[PDB]
Amino acid sequence: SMSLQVNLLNNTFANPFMNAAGVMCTTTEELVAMTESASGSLVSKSCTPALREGNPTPRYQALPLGSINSMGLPNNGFDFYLAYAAEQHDYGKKPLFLSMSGLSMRENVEMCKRLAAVATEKGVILELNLSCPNVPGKPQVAYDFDAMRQCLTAVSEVYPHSFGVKMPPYFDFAAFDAAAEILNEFPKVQFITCINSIGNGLVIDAETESVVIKPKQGFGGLGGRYVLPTALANINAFYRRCPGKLIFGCGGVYTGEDAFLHVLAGASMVQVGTALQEEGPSIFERLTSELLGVMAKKRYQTLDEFRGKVRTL
Amino acid sequence: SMSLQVNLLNNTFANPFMNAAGVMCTTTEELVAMTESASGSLVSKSCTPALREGNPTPRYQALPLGSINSMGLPNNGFDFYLAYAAEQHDYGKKPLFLSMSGLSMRENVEMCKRLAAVATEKGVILELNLSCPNVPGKPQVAYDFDAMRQCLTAVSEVYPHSFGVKMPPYFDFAAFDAAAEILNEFPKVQFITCINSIGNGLVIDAETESVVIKPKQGFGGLGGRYVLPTALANINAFYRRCPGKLIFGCGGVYTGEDAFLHVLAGASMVQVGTALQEEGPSIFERLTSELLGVMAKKRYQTLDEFRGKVRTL
Numbered sequence: 045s046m047s048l049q050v051n052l053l054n055n056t057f058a059n060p061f062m063n064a065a066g067v068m069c070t071t072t073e074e075l076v077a078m079t080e081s082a083s084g085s086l087v088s089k090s091c092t093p094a095l096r097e098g099n100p101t102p103r104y105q106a107l108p109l110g111s112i113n114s115m116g117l118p119n120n121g122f123d124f125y126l127a128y129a130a131e132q133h134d135y136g137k138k139p140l141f142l143s144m145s146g147l148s149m150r151e152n153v154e155m156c157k158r159l160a161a162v163a164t165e166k167g168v169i170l171e172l173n174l175s176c177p178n179v180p181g182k183p184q185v186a187y188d189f190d191a192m193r194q195c196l197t198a199v200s201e202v203y204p205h206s207f208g209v210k211m212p213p214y215f216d217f218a219a220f221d222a223a224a225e226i227l228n229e230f231p232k233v234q235f236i237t238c239i240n241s242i243g244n245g246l247v248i249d250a251e252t253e254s255v256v257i258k259p260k261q262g263f264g265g266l267g268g269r270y271v272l273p274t275a276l277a278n279i280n281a282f283y284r285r286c287p288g289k290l291i292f293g294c295g296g297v298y299t300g301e302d303a304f305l306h307v308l309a310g311a312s313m314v315q316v317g318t319a320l321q322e323e324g325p326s327i328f329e330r331l332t333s334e335l336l337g338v339m340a341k342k343r344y345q346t347l348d349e350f351r352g353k354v355r356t357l
Numbered sequence: 358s359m360s361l362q363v364n365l366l367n368n369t370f371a372n373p374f375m376n377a378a379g380v381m382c383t384t385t386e387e388l389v390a391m392t393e394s395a396s397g398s399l400v401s402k403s404c405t406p407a408l409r410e411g412n413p414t415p416r417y418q419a420l421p422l423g424s425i426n427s428m429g430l431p432n433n434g435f436d437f438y439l440a441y442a443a444e445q446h447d448y449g450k451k452p453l454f455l456s457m458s459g460l461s462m463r464e465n466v467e468m469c470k471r472l473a474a475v476a477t478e479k480g481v482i483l484e485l486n487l488s489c490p491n492v493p494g495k496p497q498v499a500y501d502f503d504a505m506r507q508c509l510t511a512v513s514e515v516y517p518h519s520f521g522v523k524m525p526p527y528f529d530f531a532a533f534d535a536a537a538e539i540l541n542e543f544p545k546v547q548f549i550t551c552i553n554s555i556g557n558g559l560v561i562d563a564e565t566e567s568v569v570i571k572p573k574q575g576f577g578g579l580g581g582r583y584v585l586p587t588a589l590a591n592i593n594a595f596y597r598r599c600p601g602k603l604i605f606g607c608g609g610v611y612t613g614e615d616a617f618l619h620v621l622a623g624a625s626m627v628q629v630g631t632a633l634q635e636e637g638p639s640i641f642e643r644l645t646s647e648l649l650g651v652m653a654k655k656r657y658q659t660l661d662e663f664r665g666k667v668r669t670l
């Protein structure tokens with residue numbers, strides 16, 4: 045009588061849950077573990093053309109209300125994630141997203157040219173990251189609407205497939221309108237993932253009288269409980285302003301109820317970051333169970349019945 | 358042996374605590390209550406040239422982790438707050454800040470021209486709000502740097518006194534740098550208040566499947582526990598980039614420990630919003646007491662001894 049099934053991008057997903065890019069998806073063993081998990085899908089660590097060591101440690105800290113990180117894009121490099129998608133991933137189990145985070149337009153252009161064939165042959169789907177806020181001396185691409193337009197223009201020009209974009213959060217309607225206007229000019233952009241972390245917060249430990257991460261004087265992206273209302277705002281804002289596109293939710297999901305809120309705001313897929321970092325891939329069994337439980341109590345049978353139907357006053 | 362005393366802008370404050378603008382400071386009764394409280398200071402509700410009714414209700418909601426509001430600047434009008442500063446306020450009890458939020462540059466200019474004489478005669482201090490996120494169709498001035506520079510020029514032109522600016526949160530270093538560079542052009546800007554609410558979040562009540570405030574489809578500014586690391590980040594960011602100015606902290610202060618963090622980050626004064634809304638002006642006796650307790654356990658006697666001294670790794 046009940047179903048968490050999702051159909052989009054010419055795929056069927058058993059449920060809307062997946063990891064947030066960058067969480068538990070860097071190594072072969074992590075990718076295998078996500079594939080073997082109860083999640084409906086998975087996305088690989090945001091990649092650069094060559095392997096990156098990332099920022100000095102400590103660079104992640106769990107917190108009572110979430111997390112702060114300045115990882116600095118540590119990743120195995122594009123060849124590695126391309127090879128996983130081309131040769132190793134079991135598409136029989138679930139669809140695969142590959143997150144790309146080139147440090148320049150030219151890097152994204154070069155990687156997309158090579159990804160094209162693998163997307164065609166295997167069905168891997170590109171999630172293009174325009175919102176990394178932890179690489180020193182590199183402003184978030186999507187806070188500069190001109191840099192955003194140019195990046196999307198280049199990728200659309202060279203990449204012969206649909207793709208999605210991972211967005212930083214915005215905090216005013218003018219920004220929502222400006223971002224949506226740009227995104228709506230690109231028909232290949234078929235999903236929008238809202239949101240990446242809330243950028244450059246600063247956690248201070250009262251006992252040590254110090255920051256808690258090493259890079260960038262302790263400034264890092266916030267995730268977890270801190271970001272849920274901001275995530276829902278962005279999910280709903282683009283859900284409304286980009287009616288021709290799907291929205292993937294990301295931010296502050298720890299429970300089936302949290303996920304229910306994401307869907308109500310407009311989300312098709314629901315990404316899990318901080319909570320997954322702290323619990324491991326077994327969380328997806330708990331989350332599907334919980335979401336089904338929420339739906340049971342509210343008398344919903346499918347996600348379609350309430351997606352985007354949040355009531356305004 | 359210990360003291361919460363603060364000295365700035367030719368004034369002495371018994372302690373760093375004050376209300377955040379907009380919280381419990383709209384009516385005569387509220388202003389007197391703040392003046393009679395244990396707070397080191399107070400600021401009046403952000404004003405427009407004429408009275409405003411504000412947005413339709415409900416327009417504020419207390420939450421487990423903070424608050425969301427879209428008040429829409431309900432206020433008694435400039436004449437009313439000017440009159441309170443000129444004629445009624447007991448400066449013998451504590452200094453007074455007047456918050457100003459004209460809906461246009463020209464509105465601020467005209468109010469400042471009239472405030473000048475009262476500042477001279479009575480010592481009231483202007484906090485110029487460049488960051489109201491809840492009046493529909495009106496974008497936050499401080500997210501537009503050229504506009505911000507223009508406004509500060511226009512005001513400095515007509516207002517022969519020191520003043521401060523209430524800033525929205527920023528989320529990347531390029532933005533910290535740009536804002537600080539504008540503010541550093543204007544010597545009259547002697548303090549910076551970080552931060553106004555995190556703008557346009559969206560709270561959804563899972564039981565009702567609806568938003569919780571009426572204006573703007575449920576979108577509103579976030580305060581409280583949600584905003585503390587963003588507040589600390591902005592306090593510290595401007596503390597570092599504007600060494601010729603003082604920083605007032607605002608955001609997420611519920612305890613003396615929270616206030617201790619604000620000061621460590623660089624704050625001279627510490628403003629209390631959401632917590633004050635939920636607890637009333639008695640909160641200031643608890644906060645002074647708690648901060649003294651935190652200082653005793655840590656063997657500090659004055660705020661100077663640790664202000665801005667947060668340790669990086």
Ligand SMILES: Cc1cc2nc3c(=O)[nH]c(=O)nc-3n(C[C@H](O)[C@H](O)[C@H](O)COP(=O)(O)O)c2cc1C
Pocket residue numbers: 064065066067089090104111113115117143173210239240241266267268269271294295296297315316317318319321
């Ligand atoms: C450790 C860590 C690494 C992350 N790395 C990436 C990344 O490589 N690419 C990306 O798009 N987002 C990255 N993020 C952001 C998350 O994908 C997600 O947008 C954010 O953490 C909010 O979700 P949460 O509240 O569930 O954590 C990372 C987050 C964390 C905590």
Ligand SMILES: Cc1cc2nc3c(=O)[nH]c(=O)nc-3n(C[C@H](O)[C@H](O)[C@H](O)COP(=O)(O)O)c2cc1C
Pocket residue numbers: 377378379380402403417424426428430456486523552553554579580581582584607608609610628629630631632634
């Ligand atoms: C009810 C309410 C009304 C507010 N009105 C104003 C205002 O008139 N002027 C202003 O600068 N900020 C206003 N704000 C923002 C607060 O001054 C403060 O910057 C924000 O709430 C963060 O502090 P908190 O975390 O202590 O709530 C208001 C906040 C609340 C909750």
Ligand SMILES: O=C(O)c1cc(=O)[nH]c(=O)[nH]1
Pocket residue numbers: 066090113114115116117118173175176177178179240241265
């Ligand atoms: O690798 C990182 O540091 C990182 C990337 C990103 O997109 N988001 C994030 O929070 N961290």
Ligand SMILES: O=C(O)c1cc(=O)[nH]c(=O)[nH]1
Pocket residue numbers: 379403426427428429430431486488489490491492553554578
């Ligand atoms: O009156 C309001 O709506 C308001 C003004 C402001 O500056 N900040 C805020 O959170 N609310």
Ligand code: NI
Pocket residue numbers: 187214215219528
């Ligand atoms: Ni922004």
